[PDB]
Design a protein around this ligand. Sequence first.
Ligand SMILES: *[C@@H]1O[C@H](CO)[C@@H](O[C@@H]2O[C@H](CO)[C@@H](O)[C@H](O)[C@H]2NC(C)=O)[C@H](O)[C@H]1NC(C)=O
Lengths: 641, 337
Amino acid sequence: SPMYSIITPNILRLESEETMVLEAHDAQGDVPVTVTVHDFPGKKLVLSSEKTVLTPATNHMGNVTFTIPANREFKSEKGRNKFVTVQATFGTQVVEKVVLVSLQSGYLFIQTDKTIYTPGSTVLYRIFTVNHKLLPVGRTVMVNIENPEGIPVKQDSLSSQNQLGVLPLSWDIPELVNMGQWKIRAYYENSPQQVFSTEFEVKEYVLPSFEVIVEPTEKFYYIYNEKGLEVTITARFLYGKKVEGTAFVIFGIQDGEQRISLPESLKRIPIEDGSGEVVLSRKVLLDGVQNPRAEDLVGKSLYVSATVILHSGSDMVQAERSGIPIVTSPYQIHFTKTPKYFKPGMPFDLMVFVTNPDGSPAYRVPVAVQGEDTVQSLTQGDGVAKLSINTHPSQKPLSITVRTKKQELSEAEQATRTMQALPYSTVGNSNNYLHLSVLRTELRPGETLNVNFLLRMDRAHEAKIRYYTYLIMNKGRLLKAGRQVREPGQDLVVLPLSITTDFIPSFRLVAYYTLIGASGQREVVADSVWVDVKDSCVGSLVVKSGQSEDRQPVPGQQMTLKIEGDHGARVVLVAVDKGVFVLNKKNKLTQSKIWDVVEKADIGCTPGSGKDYAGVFSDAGLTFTSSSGQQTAQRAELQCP
Amino acid sequence: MTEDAVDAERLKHLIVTPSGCGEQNMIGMTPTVIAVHYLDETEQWEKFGLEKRQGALELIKKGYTQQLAFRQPSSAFAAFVKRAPSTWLTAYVVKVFSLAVNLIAIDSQVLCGAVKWLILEKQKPDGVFQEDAPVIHQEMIGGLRNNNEKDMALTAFVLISLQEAKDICEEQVNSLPGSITKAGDFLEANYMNLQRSYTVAIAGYALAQMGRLKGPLLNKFLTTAKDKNRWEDPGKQLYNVEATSYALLALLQLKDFDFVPPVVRWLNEQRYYGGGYGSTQATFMVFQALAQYQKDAPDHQELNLDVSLQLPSRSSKITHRIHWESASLLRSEETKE
Ligand SMILES: *[C@@H]1O[C@H](CO)[C@@H](O[C@@H]2O[C@H](CO)[C@@H](O)[C@H](O)[C@H]2NC(C)=O)[C@H](O)[C@H]1NC(C)=O
């Protein structure tokens, strides 16, 4: 009997367009099907619309798009997990699979013009309302402002209808207010448990007149180095001029949450030409702490608290840099991107995330496997270095350790890491694999891609398979489905792919086929892969000055500035003096933060592959149910371990 | 201030498929129905297994479809069509259908006809109910196996059966209040002379369901408890658990929260999971009582405050209300003087 397969996202979202790809294998003729959704438990009949018929001309393919209504029954309970039932009626065959339903229904981004506000001054913040697809949406937003001790002071109830997703709001701080770290928190009406927040502080400040940046030569301190830590002070006026003053430097060890100061490291270096340097002899660092041991200092950190004073004795600026690590190794190895399951007798990919000790990705550092060290590669601009190891067709797990092989360094300084990968497990030990080898480079929208489908099966069953089914995730929901044909005998099939601007920032690709094997038992083999895309705006907004002459405009003199953006869009602007950024540069907003939030809000957390087909689909964030009885695992936790 | 419930880590055995005649059909489907009701009310399907719910629903749906064959043309039910209709079996059908109205499409006409058939000729004018067809196996009726005060307990059970389906067939049957009054008078007349805590508990539950269990009857009910934590009967402990479930349901109806927690703690202490011969009714109604502990579960909060302030300026006296949903609703007000 032909098998009917329904693929839906593993987590559903209220008030959103969620697709449900309907596919049938070996179907004969037109097979109409109506999809219905029922609450669990009970039967509340939330939605049973969007029925679709199937056609053999379109390879029995079809996707239904709808939106789960938001009712008080879902909002009645907010502290426990809730589920719904999706049921499909493939003619005379019935299939139904339960699925978890979350309460997230969009994102909130809070932009404040400044980051520090004096008492008695106004506050201007904008609330951005976007959905799971990062589009303007009309909802209801609650806004609250909380003082540092945790007491709401002002609450509102706005609506994003007719505002095109931008809600400008203002608030007036009383002239007599307890200073500290104020907080602004907002949440959607449907999901009061989901709280978004920003942080702005109230201070008794006056704007400075210059910026001080302390940049050590290397973002670390080698423990065995004899010269010691070197830090360079670069004091520059805000309006692009150099400083002639004097500076004070003090070095302290930051272990845990307790800061230990070094009285003997204080120096008075005269900054000249907007530059200066100061040394820290290793003897001072060793003797400052009680224990003269060396290895105990590993894991701690240093911080520089530089104070700069002009020769005129007018203004003082305190600039602090903290978090410089004390690590015996100038490099770090991470395996957050490498798949945890390989395929026996099949090429295996090893994405190594080589990064600087502070956390920033490294660049152009060689890496190599310990065994058969002839394999070498260099990290790209993103801090990821490709690797390739040939895997023997043995069911025994394989252990891989990688070690950087940069020259001019000893064997002790190179960072090491060890990883254990489990072999892919089939059904009935039929030795049926699928692998998907794909380019993983600094991909950009528009540039093409070449997915390499690599089937591996015995010649007795190489003719039953006649196609492939592949899906593309993006931001938690599907983006595109399709069938890639494969005539018998063609071992390798290439699938051209169009990476548009909608694939930002990381699309997860899955692929699977099906046939009858063993002694008449239906089975499925699947695969998944993780691909990165350049993090940039879906559109293109650029701000540039129209006036190309009359350098350094006089105050009070006009200029014209162009806004190059996509047509029909709404642009919000804000001009901020750089003094406040000198005195506070945290809790801002940028494209990187937005993409980090979107990536964090994903549904799967295993970069490709898995223990088995059910594991692969569960990790990829999809549930797969068949008419025959084949099914994936069960997901009942919002946050993966 | 509410005792914990069963985690259902060993409740998977309650899924028994219907088989055989109507009696065996109901014996098989009773644990499954009561288990799915308990799981739905407790919202414990996450740990019990989400995929078994659809299978259990299909099981109960096809069992409900199959049992309709045994229905007599007079809207009556029995083990076999040839066999005479049984009053207790019909009351049990009423219980099951009124419990499963939310899960299966129960025919309202069938239940209304059954209730009318029971009222018109299956009861005495005084309200006493008579059993015109004993079931094949006496182990499933529960406390009616013993002949002592059998008619009184049967009358109390049928009174509960008719009182638990008030809104189902209120308009169709107009003689229901008369039967209710007759049964209540009959039960209250002979409540003191009861010697079995099973009969005492069932009579107390029936009388408290409509409010006639007051004064000396309530005092006798309270004193019926053994060591103030359990109900005891001669014989096996199954009758003790049944009487405890009777008392628990009666107390939940009476909304007396100072004595329920010991009862539910004791019931969980024995951990009566059911199974075996002559245990369908006891397991069914003990899980039913556990379910009635849920949904309408008493909670410690009684937040209905009405807060008002007398402003010295007297421009506007601010008044608000604090409730359970607004327990953490912090209110900030500022005065300049
Ligand atoms: C999933 O649904 C979308 C809904 O639009 C389908 O997109 C359409 O695809 C056809 C051909 O594939 C185009 O002619 C239409 O213009 C598309 N619609 C829009 C609005 O652009 C999509 O094809 C569906 N997926 C599959 C595999 O069929």
